Amino acid sequence: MAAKVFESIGKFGLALAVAGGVVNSALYNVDAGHRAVIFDRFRGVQDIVVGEGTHFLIPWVQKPIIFD
Amino acid sequence: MAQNLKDLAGRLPAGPRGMGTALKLLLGAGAVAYGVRESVFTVEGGHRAIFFNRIGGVQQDTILAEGLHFRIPWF
């Protein structure tokens, strides 16, 4: 019984670490005075002005380019 | 390196029920203290470190004269 608990806790910890890494990679800091532009490569550069604001950029799609 | 951490975590003695909840509460308190410490920002006077509102950009109306103003972390 103990070994199963060990393995399950390890799997949960690994999943939590992966999720935390993804969440951290999904955020950006475009300092103010720099209004950001979403660097979305799905459907492009957002006429919807996503300026300053750490909007949740999905990884592999939206890299924060900092526009001053 | 991961297996070493595996063995180190495993080797923690299987103590009675109390210390498990004690460790959980200690971790809670540690995280809370870290958050409280981080909610304040690098602050030099001669620098009106204003609130950068996450939404709408800079706070054009929130003009921080000399004064506490806690930055919401990641915000």
Distance between the termini of chain A: 58 Å
Number of strands of chain A: 0
Strand content of chain A: under 5%
- Rounded Rg of chain B: 21 Å
Shape of chain A: elongated
Order of SSEs of chain A: H
Strand percentage of chain B: under 5%
Helix content of chain A: 25-40%
Helix content of chain B: 40-55%
Helix segment tally of chain B: 2
Our count of helices of chain A gives: 1
Quaternary structure classification: part of a larger assembly
Order of helices and strands of chain B: HH
**Given the C-alpha coordinates, what overall shape of chain B results?**
elongated
- Please give the radius of gyration of chain A in angstroms: 18 Å
Give a short synopsis of this structure.
This is part of a larger assembly, with chains A (68 residues) and B (75 residues). With 68 residues, chain A is mainly α.
Describe the structure.
Chain A: The modification N-acetylalanine is found at residue 2. Chain A: It is found in: Mitochondrion inner membrane; Nucleus; Cytoplasm; Cell membrane. Chain A has 1 helix and no strands. Chain A has one helix at 2-25. Helix content of chain B is 41%, strand content 0%. The two termini of chain B are 35 Å apart. At the A-B interface, loops of A face loops of B.
Question: SSE layout and pairings?
Answer:
This is part of a larger assembly, with chains A (68 residues) and B (75 residues).
Chain A lengths: L1 H24 L43
Chain B lengths: L1 H9 L6 H22 L37
Keywords:
part of a larger assembly; 2 chains; A: mainly alpha; 1 helix; B: mainly alpha
